[PDB]
Amino acid sequence: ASRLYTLVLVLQPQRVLLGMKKRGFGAGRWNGFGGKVQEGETIEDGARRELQEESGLTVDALHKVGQIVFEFVGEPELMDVHVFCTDSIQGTPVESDEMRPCWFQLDQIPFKDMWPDDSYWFPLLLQKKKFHGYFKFQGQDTILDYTLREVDTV
Ligand SMILES: CC(=O)Nc1ccc2c(c1)ncn2C
Predict the structure, then answer these.
(1) What is the Cα–Cα distance from 88 to 69, expressed in whole angstroms?
(2) Which ligand 1 atom is nearest residue 32's CA?
(3) What residue's CA is closest to ligand 1, atom 9?
(4) 107 marked as binding residue
(5) Residues 72/137, Cβ–Cβ less than 8 Å
(6) Measuring CA to CA, which residue among 28, 16, 92 is closest to residue 58?
(7) Which of 49, 58, 118, 136 is packed most tightly, with the most Cβ within 10 A?
(8) What separation in Å is there between the alpha carbon of 51 and the centre of ligand 1?
(9) Where does Mg(2+) 2 bind?
């Protein structure tokens, strides 16, 4: 019982792009860009499509960096999140009704206003490490338990 999702981090040598989500799941938190994968669409194409829809940016090269499974106690579907990174983009980030993008210096990543699991795996993402993770949540603020390990192949 799992549903595919993508998450794209535009990570440049001194900064990362995050978007403040205005409504829906995760509203009020800074997130990477992503969403559900369509029928007949590859995960990578879904990731490129969501990055454009949510940030206005066109990604050139995308790299697989992780896989994170989210469980919400009482929710039947697990979120199978395929995480990607890019340093090569085109366009300028666009603020829309749905998302407010902002660049953050790497030492100023706003973890207090992000999903709690980000504090766990961002340190790996910042050091160019790949990972497999699983986070069990109670509501949207509490991590009941988790696993996170570094991998050679996502
Ligand atoms: C950076 C980012 O968007 N991370 C993120 C994105 C979505 C997440 C999550 C963490 N933890 C649970 N959900 C649903």
Answers:
(1) 27
(2) 3
(3) 115
(4) no
(5) yes
(6) 92
(7) 118
(8) 15
(9) 50, 53
Pick the atom of ligand 1 nearest to 34's CA: 3
Q: Which resolution in angstroms does this entry have? A: 1.7
> Is 1-154 in CATH node 3.40.50.10860?
no
Distance CA 72, CA 140 (A): 8
| DSSP codes, 25-64 | TTTTSEE-B--BPPTT--HHHHHHHHHHHHH--EESS-EE
Query: What is the rounded distance in angstroms from the CA atom of residue 35 to the CA atom of residue 86?
Result: 17
Counting other chains too, the contacts that 32-35 makes at CB distance below 8 Å and 24 or more residues apart are 32/7, 32/8, 32/83, 33/7, 33/8, 33/99, 34/5, 34/6, 34/7, 34/8, 34/81, 35/5, 35/6
CA of 35 to the centre of ligand 1 (A): 11
For residue 13, say whether it is annotated as part of any ligand binding site.
no
Report CA(88)–ligand 1 centroid distance (Å): 22
Atom 2 (ligand 1): residue with closest C-alpha? Answer: 31
By what method was this entry solved? X-ray
What's the token pair of residue 144? Answer: 């009941």
